[PDB]
Design a protein that fits this description.
Mg(2+) 2 binds at residues 12, 499. The longest helix is centred in the first third of the chain and has 31 residues, at 54-84. Strand 21 and strand 22 form a beta hairpin. The chain has a six-stranded mixed beta sheet with strand order 7-6-1-2-3-8, sandwiched between helices. It has five domains: 7-48 and 461-634, 2-Layer Sandwich (Nucleotidyltransferase, domain 5), CATH 3.30.420.10; 56-238, no CATH class; 268-427, no CATH class; 654-722, Alpha-Beta Plaits (2-Layer Sandwich); 742-914, no CATH class. The chain is α+β, with helices and mostly antiparallel strands and 942 residues long. 39% of the residues lie in helices and 13% in strands. The structure holds three DNA and RNA strands.
Length: 942
RNA sequence: GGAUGGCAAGAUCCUGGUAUGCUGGGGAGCCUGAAAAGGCUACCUAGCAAGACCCCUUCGUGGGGUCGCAUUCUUCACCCCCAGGGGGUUC
DNA sequence: CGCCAGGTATATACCAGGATCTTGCCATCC
DNA sequence: ATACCTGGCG
């Protein structure tokens, strides 16, 4: 079903956008622009204001959940430890706010005599300390915490500052002492500081260290006379912290054996592998040489490198002191099969760094590790290998033989080489055995152990596998969708050109490799990437002006080039990129910098004249193509019903008596859905929906009003909980929380065909949550939401009377980002500040951004860039008078653009909501992927 | 313009934690009130997405573990990849 | 009320140190 | 930035 055509692909990668183009060629001459679209993605940003990516915000929330859960676990274990001890935690209720501190300071000052009062005061103190234990390095241990200066340097300075500030010195004194004393002397004092950006005085500057809290705990242990047993146990209980780790899923796998994980660099197998590979590439002068090394010489230098305790032996030392060759020039190396030969004689040869680090650690700290020292003496290298890998894999998760503890806690103070290596451990071991037994290069050892071509590079990643970087993946997803659809509609491309704007250098390498795998699979002659501004010179030396290509008005009181203005330029950059070859971009990019840094008109060369004569046609191809409005700006749609279910701040409920008078606002606010349905029945007995207008009473103060429920019957003085605010809300964890942003909106309409009324139902994730519609197999856009859901509670009253009367039916659904093409007739309901905007920017393509209230929808122009308009707005307020009238208009408009009344939007015969293919062509057929439709005339659901 | 050894900085997440914050439950100090009932500034305590599942059972009517704000066309339908994950759908 | 148009609240900020990546620099050998 | 508030003007 694909018609083969000779074409070229062009990609222009931006920070928040990507320009894609498929262009057919004659010979090397462009005849027609098959497709040219500029997709506008978000860069993976989840909170636009923070800048945090969606992925990051998710991970933060995940780790917060697990922090809370582990804290629950250790606190319940602490309660279990100080039950059998005989102590008593702080009860949740009925205590004094200053009992914990009064405890923690008396226990550190005086010896409490009564054993019961001692035990409860201790229970108070340790319970509170575990609940407020301070900070420490997650990688260190409790026995490591015990070995730090106690008290802290920060705490000693804070304490000296407090002693001079409050004119009192406290022995010893602990942070509990100063806290309880300041909560006595100057009440209302805040302990740790905070910033919320006004006027207040705190008691502490820096975060308190767990070492200070442990210091206070041992002060109490000394003063109260506690045995070594229980004091050690309770410190291990209060400062119990899970040790950080990498999950085994995040380590790369070995390309030669994908069943195995990348080894640690500290690995003994790797140290041997590196030395054996370094020597296996050595050659010795025999004339008019050269020769491989004899088995004896190779073993000699391998053992000489393995045994050394420092990295001192150079290659000159190998060539003279070991191989006994006359001069250093008689030894060289060859790195590749059929490649050049060189060797720096001054450089050092590799050595086993981990065995040497263990050697110096044993020689320095031998008293502390007597059995390990003797162990690593006589054990052969196959056992040492497993031990070193166990040390590395427990030092990063991630045992093994006859381990005494006393030595083991010093063995964790050992610094081994960090980082991982390309190949697995068993792979290194096998490659060394073949290189040692057969005296052979690494490239032939590869073939001996595994069946592999000569030579072969480790496999390059494909398009359908991610980069982990959220900014690069938006580009990757759009690109692979476009390229798949282009290979299906037309032929596979002949050339692929990509341009980037180290932040995008990684993006360059990732995109390049994935397109290289694509090319060697589907057969593309040339695939090139370029940095960074090759297209700007290509254009403005071929006289392609983007404000002249698209007839757009001047913007400044100057004659500046407004190229970032129209978001279609990404596409046109793509289309011009398809005309390039590495040499032409070479000679153009040189000239750009040659000019911008240092009569006069430039350049010309045999490739440049050929390029220009072959590409002369584009000047008019672009005019014709932009005239027919063939260039499309698109925004991908977010349909997945995932994200924040509700706003995060819990809010306190209000209450309302059943017998009192009600208004519409107070009835929409009823929390219980059963109580809600009861009052909806009392407001209209045959009604399915709440048809009340807020700000206006609908029920009297019926003194004998009862509402019968299957739970219970309520009396006229009973109280029912109400949400705090007359806005879409839900109940989570005993509080009220506003719904989050709307997932989508459903477009209903009713009335005559020649003049119909429209309305929107603003559907949120809280709506789908309470309706239990997040199960499998649900269509979130057409699945009835009960009348109690916040969506129906806050629909337009016109809508809720029209839907219950059966006249209104769901006709479509809108989701943030999709496109509103008002066709050739354009916005006719223009009024106010919008119309003065349309006199200078005649925009017909609009993008949905939100659903502000129960009667409006938020639209931004699709072709104009928000960031450039912000540039203008910040510019006029700092440098005024430097704008045209259209510049002032564009500056004032864009922060919120069109905040349109839905009534004045959907009343456009034919207006099309456009849903594009990756190639930028509107789907018209009512297929399984989302498709275009017209609100004025579209078959209702079912 | 190649090869090799080393250094530094940056980027993206991942793991474990620290203070705040919010709601519920408390009460040291305090200001308005003849009250009566509510605000203040701190501190103590539980929880922090709604939820979906497993496991071990000594069967405790109680306990241990995972997933839950990413992968921008949900769900339904076709075409693909090396029996679970990842992709594409031309207007 | 229909239709605009201004104004404003949202959870937020640290830590050390792995895994996965990129640039830029230094030096010594062809 | 998004979804709330108030409020003018007819």
């Amino acid at each position: 079903g694909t018609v083969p055509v000779t074409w070229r692909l062009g990609v222009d990668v931006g920070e928040r956008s990507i320009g894609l183009a498929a262009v057919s060629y004659e010979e090397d001459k462009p005849k027609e622009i098959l497709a040219a679209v500029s997709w506008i993605h978000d860069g993976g940003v989840g909170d636009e204001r923070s800048g945090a990516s969606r992925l990051a915000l998710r991970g933060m929330a995940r780790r917060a959940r697990r922090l809370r859960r582990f804290r629950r676990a250790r606190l319940r274990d602490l309660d279990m430890l100080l039950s059998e001890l005989g102590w008593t935690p702080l009860p949740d209720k009925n205590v004094s706010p200053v009992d914990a501190w009064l405890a923690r300071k008396r226990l550190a000052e005086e010896y409490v005599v009564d054993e019961t009062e001692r035990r409860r005061l201790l229970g108070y103190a340790v319970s509170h300390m575990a609940r407020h234990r301070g900070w420490r390095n997650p990688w260190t241990t409790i026995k490591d915490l015990k070995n730090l200066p106690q008290p802290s340097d920060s705490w000693e300075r804070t304490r000296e500052s407090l002693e001079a500030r409050y004119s009192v010195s406290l022995e010893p004194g602990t942070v509990g002492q100063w806290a309880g004393y300041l909560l006595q002397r100057a009440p209302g004092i805040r302990l740790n500081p905070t910033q919320q950006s006004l006027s207040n005085a705190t008691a502490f500057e820096t975060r308190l260290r767990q070492e200070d809290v442990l210091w206070e705990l041992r002060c109490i242990a000394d003063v109260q006379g506690l045995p070594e047993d229980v004091v050690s146990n309770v410190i291990d209980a209060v400062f119990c912290q899970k040790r950080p780790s990498v999950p085994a899923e995040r380590i790369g796998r070995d390309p030669l054996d994908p069943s195995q994980l990348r080894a640690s660099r500290a690995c003994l197998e790797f140290q041997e592998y590196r030395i054996v590979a370094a020597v296996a590439n050595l050659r010795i002068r025999d004339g008019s040489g050269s020769r491989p090394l004899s088995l004896e010489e190779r073993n000699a230098v391998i053992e000489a490198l393995l045994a050394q305790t420092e990295r001192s032996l150079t290659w000159s030392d190998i060539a003279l002191e070991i191989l006994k060759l006359p001069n250093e020039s008689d030894l060289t190396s060859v790195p590749e099969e059929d490649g050049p030969s060189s060797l720096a004689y001054s450089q050092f040869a590799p050595f086993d760094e981990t065995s040497a680090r263990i050697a110096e650690f044993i020689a320095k700290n031998r008293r502390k590790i007597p059995t390990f020292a003797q162990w690593w003496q006589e054990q052969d290298r196959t056992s040492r290998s497993d031990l070193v890998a166990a040390l590395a894999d427990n030092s990063i998760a991630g045992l093994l033989v006859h381990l005494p503890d006393a030595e083991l806690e010093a063995l964790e103070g050992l610094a081994l080489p960090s980082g991982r290596v390309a190949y697995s451990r068993l792979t290194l071991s096998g490659l060394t055995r073949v290189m040692r037994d057969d005296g052979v290069d690494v490239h032939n050892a590869r073939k001996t152990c595994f069946g592999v071509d000569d030579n072969w590079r480790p496999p390059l990643p494909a398009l359908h596998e991610a980069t982990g970087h959220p900014v690069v993946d938006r580009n990757l997803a759009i690109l692979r969708k476009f390229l798949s659809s282009a290979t299906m509609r037309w032929g596979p491309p002949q050339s692929i050109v990509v341009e980037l704007g180290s932040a995008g250098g990684y993006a360059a390498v990732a995109l390049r490799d994935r397109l290289l795998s694509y090319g060697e699979k589907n057969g593309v002659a040339q695939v090139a990437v370029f940095r960074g501004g090759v297209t700007a010179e290509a254009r403005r030396w071929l006289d392609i002006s983007i404000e002249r290509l698209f007839s757009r008005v001047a913007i400044f009181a100057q004659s500046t080039s407004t190229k970032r203005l129209d978001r279609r330029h990404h596409a046109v950059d793509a289309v011009v990129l398809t005309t390039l070859t590495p040499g032409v971009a070479k000679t153009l990019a040189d000239a750009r910098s040659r000019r911008v840094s240092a009569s006069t008109e430039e350049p010309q060369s045999p490739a440049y004249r050929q390029w220009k004569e072959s590409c002369s046609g584009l000047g008019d191809l672009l005019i014709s193509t932009a005239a027919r409005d063939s260039i499309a700006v698109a925004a991908p749609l977010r349909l997945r019903p995932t994200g924040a279910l509700h706003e995060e701040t819990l809010r306190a409920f209000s209450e309302h008596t059943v017998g009192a008078a009600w208004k519409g606002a107070e009835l929409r606010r009823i929390v219980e859905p059963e109580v809600y349905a009861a009052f909806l029945a009392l407001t209209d007995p045959g009604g399915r929906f709440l048809k009340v207008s807020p700000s206006e009473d609908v029920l009297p103060a019926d003194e004998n009003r009862h509402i019968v429920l299957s739970d219970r019957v309520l009396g006229p003085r009973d109280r029912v909980k109400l949400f705090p605010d007359d806005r879409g809300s839900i109940r989570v964890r005993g509080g009220a929380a506003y719904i989050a942003s709307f997932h989508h909106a459903r477009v209903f309409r009713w009335g005559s065909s020649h003049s119909p009324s429209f309305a929107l139902l603003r559907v949120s994730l809280a709506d789908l949550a309470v309706a239990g519609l997040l199960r499998d197999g649900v269509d979130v856009f057409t699945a009835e939401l009960p009348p109690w859901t916040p969506a129906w509670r806050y629909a337009s009253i016109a809508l809720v009377k029209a839907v219950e009367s059966g006249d209104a039916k769901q006709v479509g659904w809108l989701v943030p980002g999709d496109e509103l093409d008002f066709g050739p007739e354009g916005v006719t309901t223009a009024a106010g500040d919008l119309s003065m905007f349309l006199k200078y920017f005649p925009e017909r393509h609009w993008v949905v951004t939100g659903f502000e209230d129960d009667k409006r929808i938020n639209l931004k122009p699709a072709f104009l860039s928000a960031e450039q308009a912000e540039v203008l707005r910040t510019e006029r307020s700092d440098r005024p008078d430097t704008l045209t009238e259209a510049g002032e208009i564009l500056a004032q408009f864009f922060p919120r653009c069109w905040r349109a009344t839905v009534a004045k939007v959907l009343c456009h015969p034919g207006l099309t909501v456009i849903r594009r293919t990756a190639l930028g062509q509107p789907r018209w057929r009512r297929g399984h992927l989302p498709y275009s439709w017209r609100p004025w005339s579209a078959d209702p659901w079912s």
